[PDB]
Structure formats: structure tokens, C-alpha cells
């Protein structure tokens, strides 16, 4: 932590012995070595003559600030050249093999943190050459690069511009460009060498996990992914990681999950260059085209031996097991020739010492031809209702004990996303993980409070008392699935009985079967039990309670009368619909999960809305068009960020009736500083409310001046602000009747010019953001914008979304 660095650390002692060796007779003042003071002293003292220890300390301080969600990029904004020199030194130290693996992992984590801070101008400028097209110069074959350049003319133009910039540069600039282009290739080669080095320790596994997380983060941002995906496909990082001994270890479950996440992100159905999200049909067509090209190459080269492989169908060759014998039929030389015919890399540098055998080539060919499920298919395959295995997942347990020391194989929200569907799938996955963690915590708390134990005869009983769960009998299926569960409220309090009897329709409940005797297997010196086996829980099934019935099976028409009246029987019947997927899985596996169920656990109504939110997220992910076309570029973080504003949209309203937005003419004049206001009529006198503002663009008179080409170099382009004429029109308001109640309500709040501009932006079509502090009258501006939208567009509907009910009540009171 940051407070641990304030002590007498080894790095602080080394810095004091190396950098604080001044002979000045300083006073003996007991000043605490704060982290902020040390960072401020290191920032001004940084220079080109500083050693690598200062750069390592600065990188560690930046990582500690990023782990605490503190800004650190602003402190480097004062010195851009020093920041660039520090970044170059960190890049040089990352490729240096003399240092330990911990320093390399720290440098990789710092680079991954810097890659997630592309909003800063200096960080984006530093990371621009690292993910540029020059990495395409590190391809295995020139034919593949030529085909990629001929596929899109924009890529060829960018490559030509990069080549011209490299040729026109000096020697030091060309060396820096070559180092920036080859840094990613050197890092990939070092990762591949460390994966196949053997006898990997925990530091090597942590470095591999950090590299996988960095690759996933690079593939998550489209401007970097457009080269990162091509580099990973040319280098065959996934086939090398699949056959690596580090990922094959049983203890490296997090590394395997990170590799799976990186493979899912790299094989996403989205265009690398254009950035348009690809559907399932486009991905299927691309896979069919790749399979047809492979079959044509096999027929042209090895038709005598690979006739079955060339004549195989798309579904008969996409499977790894089906294509295993076809690839095993060809020899090593035949496999090498087939890989060279498809522009696939089959050899590596001798310095990396990457083992390239027939098994590695077969795995690469199987992974390249494997059909991969799309993001929509992965979102549809994910169950909304949590299960016993999903709640007790290894990834959830790893994320529960996360402290920032190691990466996690979960999606991360950033400033830019590959596609709207990918962002929706990531949000759905995060919401499902949070709901599963909350459900697992609630189930663990209920099992701890219930204190299950083994009674006489082997029947599992509950010794403790818990209000979050109740023991029940085995449920009986009524229709198919709708079932009836019998509960007893004789030992429950009146408040608990009232809470249990007031279950709303489709309420999320859990049917739990628990056997504590398996916990005795943990006491016999056997294998290590899981978290669910430690508490005795065996199975948990989600269900939706629809209705609550009495002991006679009749629905309670009056709940208040039943609660106030004397109940004859304390036994209640609850109608529960179990999930169809879990029931079908139990029926297919012939498992009697419902026969052993003996506990029913309820949840709070505020925290039982996760299933509908997950269903809505899955429906949005499966939807083809979940976002507007005008706001797609702004939401994706690509292109011009101001393109969604009203000043750039073609549907901007020229004339807008503000009605009673301005109290008088002076308020309207003061609300538009720097803009010329002219009355619509010929009367020079000021007019009161209501007022309508029409924005007229001032047409520049193109005078017939001579085309002088001499005075054109020193004439810089002046930022001439277009003075749009805000013509004010005054009209008599329509009377609504002679009664005093018929008089329309007028606003009595004098809005500021910033509030007036915000209201004008909100009234106009497009995207508007109002950054308002507390007490700035943002609710009043929102109410004024809603009133203006209702008055100007009676046929349009306005949907207000409030974070809290108090804000909605305040908005309703203002309206």
C-alpha cells in the first residue's frame, strides 16, 4: 500500500544512499516521508541522467496511484519530454532480460494501466506509435502483408505514409520508430519463450497473466485492436498459449481463464478496420470462405492424400475432433507446405527458441479452422438464473479475494469499446457476476445462520433459526414448471410470517438441498472440500413464486383480512415456477434434484430484481439495433466526440419557441453573450414574454476578389466564430378562458447564461450533457427543458430517468 512505502524500505534506503548523498548539513527534524512528498520530489528531480532505480520507483508510485483510483497522468502533464523519456526507458527495461521477472511484470502492469488512459493527450501520443501499422512490418511473410494492404486502400495509404515518414526521418528518429515497431514483437517473443522455458515459478505465471490481460486490453480498444488482432493471428499466440506448459498446469486456472477471455476478445465478430460489428451470418460466411480456401489449397496441393479433407463440408471440418484425422493424415512436410500456402507462420526466430513441431502446427491449424461462437451466442448461452455451479465458480472465488496483486479474467469498462453489442455483453456479464456473488453471499449467510447438522437416521436438520430461509418438505411438480411447496410458519414470528405470506408474483426464491454429512468427509482427512461442501449445501435452484395459497390450496383474496384475522392453520402452500433449462438438464441427466430439496430461501424485494435486469441485458445484446445511429459513434468513443451535438447534426431546429423561458428582454439579452440579437419586426422597442428564438446563419458575401496566390502562406486560418442571428419573435399567447385557473403558469426563475445554453442544447435534438454541481438548479433546467419539449412538440413523448425517487418527486413538483 501507499502507507507501507513510508517506512524504512529497501528501495527508500537505496534511494537515500544513491541520490540523497548531498553533504549539506540539514537539521535533525523528524519529518515523515510521505508518499506525496516523495512523488513530488521525484517528479522535479527526474532527468535524462537518472538511473533505472528512479524510473522503477516512479513506475511503482504510478501503479500505486492507479490501484487507489488516484490521478497520476496529470502530474506528468507539466513535462512532456521527461514523460516521453520515462516511457522510452520503461519500454527499454521491459525488453531487457537482465532484470527479474517481478520488474517485468510491474512494467507490463504499468504499460497496461497507461494503455487504459488514452484520454490523456500525452499518453495517446506515446501509445500511438506502439499500435501503429509499422507492426505489420513484423509479419511472417510479405505476401500476407501485401494481401492485407490490397484488401483495404486505407491500410495501404497508411502503410505508404508510415514508410514515407520513416524514410524522411533522421537516424535517431528512424531508430526510435524501429524500436517502437519491434517492441511488441520482442514482448511477444519473450512471452512465448517464457511460456515454453519450463520450471516456471509464481512470478512467471503472474507475468503470463499480466501479458494476457494486456493483450485483452489491447484487443478491447479498436484503434489498437486493428493491429493487435493481426499481430496475434500472425504470431499464433493462442496456439502457443494452448500448448504451453504454464497454461496446462492445474493451478493456473486464472491464466487459462484469461487466455480464454483473450481468445474470445480476439475472435469477436467485428470488423478490425471499419469497426462495424459483424453479425452471426457475416462470421459464418467468413468461416465458410476460410474453409473453402483451405479446401481449394488442399485440392490444388494434396488431392491424392487429402481428398476427404478437401471434399469435407463446413460443419464436418470446423470441429477439432473431425479435423484431427485429416491433419494427422498429412506429414510434417505436408503440414508445413499447407501452412505456407495459407500464409500461416510455421517458424520462429532462433533467439526465442520456440519449439515448432508437428503437434504445434496441428494445434494452430485446428484453432484457425475452429468455429467460434459469437458474442450474441455467448450471451444467449449464459443462464440468467444462477445455479449451484455458477454461484460457487472458481472465477467468482478468485474475484472475491481480489486485491489488485493479480489480474482477473473479467471484462473491463473503458472509454472506448469494440462494438455496442460487445459493450452490452460485457455489462451483462458484469451484472450476472455481481448477482451471482450477491446470491452466493446471501446463501452462505443463510446457511451459517441456519447451522445445518446431521440428526438421527441421517436426516439433515437445522439447529439455528434464520429469517432468510425456512425448512420445507420435498416439492411436488403440479404442471409442466409449476410446483407447490409446503411451508410451516408455526415457529416463525408474526413479522416473519407476514413477510413470507406477502410474497409478490414472480418473486426470486431459491430451493436448496443441503447435506451436512459430506462436511464430515472434510473431517476424515480426505480431499479439500469446496465452499458449498463446507456449509453442507449440495444444490440450489432458482424459482419464481407466483402466488401464495393457504393450507386448503385456496388463494388469499384479502391479505389484510387474512393477516388481521385468526388463521386456522399455520401451514402455507406456495406456487413456484422452476426454470425450464435447469429442469430439462435434470431430466436429461435423470437427477432427482427436487426430491432432496428441503429448504426455501427468500430475498429482499429491492435485491431480487437481478433476473429481469439480466433478461433485459441479454435481449439488448441479442438485438441487432440496440442503439441509435447518430449516437453510436459517441457511445463507441470513435470519431469526433462532438458529432452527436446539435451543431453537427443535420436535423437541427432553426426556430425554437422558448415561450416563457426568458423573464424579460434584458434576461434574454444577458443569456446570449457574444451573439447579435435583432428583433423580427420593425419596432425597435423591446418586447416581453413569450418569445421565440430563430437561429439564422449569417451568409458571408463572397466578393469577386482576384485570386492572389502570393499572400497565402503567412495567412493562418483564423477561428472566426459564426455569429448566428438569434431573431426574437413576439406573439400574443392564446387565451384559455376568463377564469383565473385558466391562466398558464409562468417560470419565475432567472436562469443563468450557462443554464440557458444547457436548456437550448436540451431542447435541440442530439446529445446534451449538463455538468452541474450541487445547488446549481439542474432539476429546474431539466424541468424547463421538459416543458419546452412538451410545448413545442405535443406529439413527442419525453422519458425521464431518475437515480432516486426523491429526484423524480422533485421533478414532478417542479413540473
Amino acid at each position: 500500500t501507499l502507507e507501507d512505502l513510508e517506512g524504512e524500505n529497501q528501495f527508500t534506503n537505496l534511494a537515500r544512499q544513491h541520490w540523497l548523498n548531498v553533504p549539506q548539513q540539514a537539521a535533525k527534524i523528524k519529518v515523515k516521508t510521505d508518499v506525496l512528498k516523495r512523488e513530488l520530489y521525484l517528479w522535479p528531480g527526474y532527468g535524462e541522467d537518472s538511473s533505472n532505480y528512479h524510473v522503477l520507483l516512479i513506475i511503482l508510485i504510478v501503479n500505486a496511484k492507479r490501484r487507489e483510483r488516484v490521478s497520476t497522468w496529470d502530474i506528468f502533464a507539466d513535462r512532456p519530454a521527461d514523460f516521453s523519456d520515462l516511457f522510452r526507458r520503461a519500454l527499454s527495461m521491459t525488453l531487457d532480460s537482465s532484470l527479474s521477472w517481478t520488474i517485468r511484470t510491474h512494467v507490463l502492469l504499468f504499460i497496461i494501466h497507461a494503455f487504459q488512459s488514452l484520454d490523456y493527450a500525452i499518453v495517446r501520443k506515446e501509445c500511438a506509435p506502439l499500435v501503429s501499422i509499422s507492426i505489420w512490418h513484423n509479419l511472417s511473410t510479405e505476401e500476407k502483408r501485401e494481401a492485407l494492404l490490397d484488401s483495404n486502400p486505407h491500410l495501404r495509404k497508411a502503410w505508404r505514409a508510415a514508410t514515407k515518414r520513416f524514410e524522411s526521418a533522421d537516424d535517431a528518429t528512424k531508430a526510435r520508430l524501429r524500436f517502437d515497431r519491434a517492441w511488441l514483437y520482442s514482448l511477444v517473443l519473450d512471452f512465448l519463450t517464457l511460456l515454453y522455458s519450463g520450471n516456471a515459478k509464481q512470478e512467471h505465471v503472474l507475468y503470463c497473466e499480466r501479458f494476457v490481460e494486456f493483450l485483452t486490453d489491447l484487443q478491447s480498444q479498436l484503434p489498437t485492436r486493428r493491429y493487435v488482432n493481426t499481430l496475434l493471428q500472425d504470431l499464433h499466440v493462442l496456439p502457443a498459449l494452448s500448448l504451453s506448459p504454464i497454461y496446462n498446469d492445474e493451478g493456473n486456472g486464472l491464466l487459462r481463464e484469461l487466455c480464454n477471455l483473450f481468445t474470445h476478445y480476439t475472435y469477436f465478430a467485428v470488423d478490425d478496420q471499419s469497426g462495424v460489428q459483424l453479425s452471426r451470418e457475416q462470421a459464418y460466411d467468413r468461416h465458410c470462405a476460410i474453409l473453402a480456401k483451405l479446401q481449394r489449397i488442399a485440392m490444388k496441393h494434396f488431392k491424392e492424400k487429402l481428398t476427404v479433407l478437401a471434399l469435407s463440408n463446413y460443419g464436418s471440418i470446423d470441429k477439432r475432433s473431425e479435423l484431427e484425422p485429416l491433419l494427422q493424415a498429412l506429414t510434417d512436410d505436408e503440414l508445413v507446405q499447407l501452412s505456407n500456402l495459407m500464409n500461416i507462420r510455421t517458424s520462429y526466430p532462433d533467439a526465442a527458441r520456440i519449439p515448432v513441431d508437428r503437434k504445434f502446427i496441428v494445434e494452430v491449424l485446428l484453432t484457425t479452422f475452429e468455429r467460434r461462437k459469437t458474442f450474441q451466442d455467448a450471451a444467449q448461452a449464459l443462464s440468467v438464473l444462477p445455479t449451484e455451479e455458477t454461484l460457487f465458480d472458481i472465477s467468482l472465488k478468485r474475484t472475491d479475494q481480489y486485491d489488485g496483486s493479480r489480474p482477473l479474467a473479467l471484462p473491463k469498462l473503458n472509454l472506448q469499446y469494440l462494438s455496442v453489442g460487445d459493450f452490452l455483453w460485457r455489462s451483462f456479464v458484469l451484472y450476472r457476476c455481481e448477482s451471482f456473488y450477491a446470491i452466493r453471499q446471501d446463501l452462505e449467510d443463510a446457511l451459517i445462520r441456519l447451522k445445518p447438522e446431521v440428526r438421527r437416521g441421517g436426516v439433515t436438520g437445522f439447529a439455528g433459526f434464520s429469517k432468510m430461509a425456512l425448512p420445507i418438505s420435498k416439492p411436488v411438480i403440479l404442471d409442466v414448471v409449476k410446483a407447490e411447496v409446503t411451508i410451516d410458519l408455526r415457529r416463525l414470528t408474526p413479522q416473519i410470517r407476514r413477510d413470507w405470506e406477502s410474497l409478490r408474483p414472480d418473486d426470486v426464491v431459491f430451493l436448496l438441498a443441503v447435506d451436512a454429512s459430506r462436511q464430515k468427509q472434510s473431517a476424515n482427512g480426505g480431499a479439500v472440500l469446496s465452499e458449498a461442501e463446507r456449509l453442507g449445501l449440495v444444490h440450489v435452484r432458482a424459482a419464481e413464486i407466483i402466488q401464495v395459497l393457504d393450507d386448503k390450496g385456496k388463494a388469499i383474496r384479502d391479505p389484510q383480512a387474512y393477516f388481521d384475522g385468526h388463521t386456522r392453520s399455520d401451514i402455507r402452500k406456495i406456487q413456484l415456477r422452476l426454470d425450464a433449462t435447469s429442469y430439462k438438464a435434470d431430466t436429461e441427466a435423470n437427477r432427482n434434484v427436487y426430491e432432496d430439496i428441503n429448504l426455501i430461501v427468500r430475498r429482499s424485494s429491492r435485491e431480487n430484481n437481478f433476473k429481469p435486469v439480466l433478461e433485459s441485458i441479454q435481449d439488448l445484446t441479442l438485438s441487432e439495433v440496440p442503439l441509435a445511429s447518430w449516437l453510436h459513434e459517441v457511445f463507441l468513443g470513435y470519431g469526433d466526440p462532438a458529432g452527436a451535438t446539435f451543431k453537427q447534426l443535420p436535423n437541427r431546429l432553426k426556430k425554437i419557441n422558448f415561450r416563457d423561458t426568458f423573464l424579460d428582454w434584458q434576461h434574454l439579452v444577458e443569456s446570449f453573450p457574444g451573439k447579435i440579437i435583432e428583433p423580427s419586426d420593425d419596432v425597435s422597442s423591446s418586447f416581453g414574454p413569450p418569445y421565440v428564438l430563430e437561429s439564422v446563419e449569417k451568409q458571408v458575401e463572397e466578393h469577386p476578389s482576384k485570386p492572389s496566390k502570393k499572400r497565402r502562406r503567412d495567412v493562418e486560418p483564423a477561428l472566426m466564430s459564426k455569429v448566428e442571428t438569434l431573431k426574437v419573435s413576439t406573439y400574443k399567447p392564446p387565451n384559455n378562458g376568463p377564469y383565473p385557473v385558466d391562466a398558464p403558469k409562468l417560470n419565475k426563475i432567472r436562469f443563468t447564461p450557462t443554464q440557458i445554453d444547457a436548456i437550448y442544447s436540451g431542447t435541440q435534438p442530439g446529445l446534451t450533457i449538463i455538468v452541474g454541481p450541487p445547488g446549481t438548479g439542474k432539476t429546474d433546467v431539466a424541468v424547463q427543458i421538459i416543458s419546452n419539449i412538451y410545448h413545442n412538440f405535443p406529439e413527442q413523448k419525453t422519458l425521464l430517468v431518475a437515480h432516486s425517487n426523491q429526484a423524480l418527486n422533485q421533478l414532478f413538483a417542479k413540473i
Partner: protein, 280 residues
């Protein structure tokens, strides 16, 4: 309600003489009192073109086991009519997660309930998949129907339907290839697809005897004659013959054998002796 019966008797001809959405709403409002004629309203759904409404009415009729058809129509006949209407109007029927309907689950339920007409349901599902433009899904459905048919008549009907669909696809591909070759345009992808279809048809024709042997073994695992026929159809493949012999040994019950398991054991011993494996 007693007078509402006479009112509906005086309004049925009025609704029939009006037609359209108003008559559809009148029939929907009249189904809450006399649902026994609601199947006739399904005929109105035939007249109005609402295939989804007809499917929903059929599902609601099949959900209630106490419903009695006025026209003395059985539940199997109603299910077959609904399947035929779904196959004929697969394009006009909207399917999605918003409506909360599944055609595969209904097809599986119909196959499980009607075991004597499971091949007809599989053929209807294959025809619906072919009409939906999904050739791979139709091929997978045909393979699943061939691999899960207990009766050989249903398996033969499903195989004939799949062979007819494959022959139609191969003829269309050959016509497209001939049209491309006559125009001087060489399409390697179309020729590769035609060759792959021909190879798949040849593989299906070769594995049809294997599928018949598997169906015979599923009908009677203790039948040594089917195992002997499968071993004869294996030919010179020693590994396939050994696997078939092991499956026959592990599948045929010695206490319920209808054939001669000792004859199969003697044949295996003679094959081992002819291979020179006296110890085996």
C-alpha cells in the same frame, strides 16, 4: 350468461358478416364463454391469415386436457394440423425471445408423445428448416432424426426425405455451375460446394447400411443376427470388426439372447485364428 348464450347465438352470424379485426376481437371475446368452438375460430385465423394466433389457439387448446373437440378431432390430429400449418407458414410466423415460444421444444414434445409418427415430425421439422434457408440446421435435424428413430419405417421415411432434399440441393448447385460455365465465369466456391455435397451424399449412402445396422441393434441388442450382419458389413476393417464384436458382447444379454452368442464367439475365435493370434 344464460341470456349471453342467446346473445352470442344472435351475434355469431353478425361477426361472420363483418370479418376483419373487429370479428377477430368478437371471436376472442366470445371464447371466454364457449371455448369449444374456438377451434372453429382457428379456422377464422385461417381466414384472417394470422398463423401466430392460430398457433397460440392450438397451444391453448392442447394445454387444457379437459378440452373436447366439437368436430370429434383427436389431439394427435390437431397436433398434426398445427405442425402442417407451421410448416406451410414458417416464413409468415414470427419467432423470437420476445414472444416466449419455441418450435424445437414443441417438435420434441410431439415426437415424444407420438412415437409412431416421430419420423413425420422429423420430416416436417426438416422441411421447415429447409424453408427457413438454414441448410446446416436441416442437415443436423435429419441426422438427429436418423440417429434417434426406433422404428425403421420412420427412419426410412426420414432418410428418403433427406435424400430428396440433398438431391434437390445438388441439382440446384449443378444447374448453377452449368449456368456459370456457359457464361464463362469460373466460380471455385460453387464447384467446391458441389463437390462437398456430392461427397456428403456418397458418405451418407455408404453409412446408410451402418445406420440400418445401428437401428437393428437399437431395436434388439440381443439379436446376434444384426451383430453378424454389422460384422460382415465391416469387411476387412479389423478395428471396426473388433469394435462391433465388443459392442455385441457388451450389448447382447446372455439370459435374453434371441440369436446365438456362442456362434458370434466362435466367429470371433475363427477370425483371431485366421489372423494368427492363437493367444487372443
Amino acid at each position: 350468461i344464460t341470456q349471453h348464450n342467446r346473445i352470442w347465438a344472435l351475434y355469431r352470424p353478425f361477426a361472420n358478416s363483418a370479418e376483419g379485426i373487429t370479428a377477430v376481437k368478437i371471436w376472442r371475446r366470445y371464447m371466454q364463454v364457449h371455448p369449444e368452438d374456438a377451434e372453429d375460430f382457428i379456422e377464422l385465423l385461417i381466414q384472417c391469415g394470422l398463423y401466430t394466433e392460430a398457433v397460440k389457439k392450438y397451444i391453448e387448446i392442447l394445454n387444457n386436457p379437459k378440452f373436447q373437440s366439437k368436430n370429434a378431432k383427436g389431439h394427435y390430429e390437431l397436433w398434426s394440423e398445427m405442425v402442417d400449418l407451421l410448416v406451410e407458414h414458417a416464413v409468415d410466423i414470427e419467432t423470437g425471445h420476445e414472444t416466449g415460444i419455441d418450435v424445437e421444444r414443441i417438435i420434441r414434445s410431439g415426437i415424444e408423445r407420438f412415437s409412431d409418427q416421430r419420423g413425420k415430425l422429423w420430416s416436417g421439422l426438416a422441411t421447415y428448416w429447409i424453408r427457413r434457408g438454414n441448410f446446416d440446421r436441416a442437415r443436423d435435424v435429419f441426422e438427429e432424426g436418423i440417429t434417434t428413430v426406433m422404428t425403421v419405417r420412420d427412419f426410412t421415411m426420414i432418410f428418403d426425405a433427406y435424400v430428396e432434399f440433398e438431391e434437390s440441393v445438388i441439382g440446384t448447385l449443378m444447374e448453377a455451375a452449368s449456368r456459370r460455365a456457359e457464361k464463362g465465369v469460373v466460380d471455385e466456391s460453387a464447384d467446391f460446394d458441389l463437390d462437398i455435397r456430392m461427397m456428403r451424399f456418397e458418405h451418407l449412402m455408404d453409412r446408410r447400411p451402418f445406420l440400418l445396422n445401428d437401428v437393428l441393434l437399437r431395436q434388439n441388442p440381443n439379436n446376434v443376427a444384426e451383430w453378424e450382419k454389422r460384422v460382415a458389413l465391416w469387411g476387412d476393417n479389423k478395428e471396426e470388426v473388433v469394435k462391433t464384436y465388443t459392442d455385441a458382447i457388451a450389448a447382447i444379454n446372455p439370459k435374453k439372447a434371441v440369436g446365438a452368442f456362442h456362434l458370434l464367439w466362435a466367429n470371433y475365435a475363427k477370425f483371431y485364428e485366421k489372423a494368427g493370434d492363437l493367444r487372443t
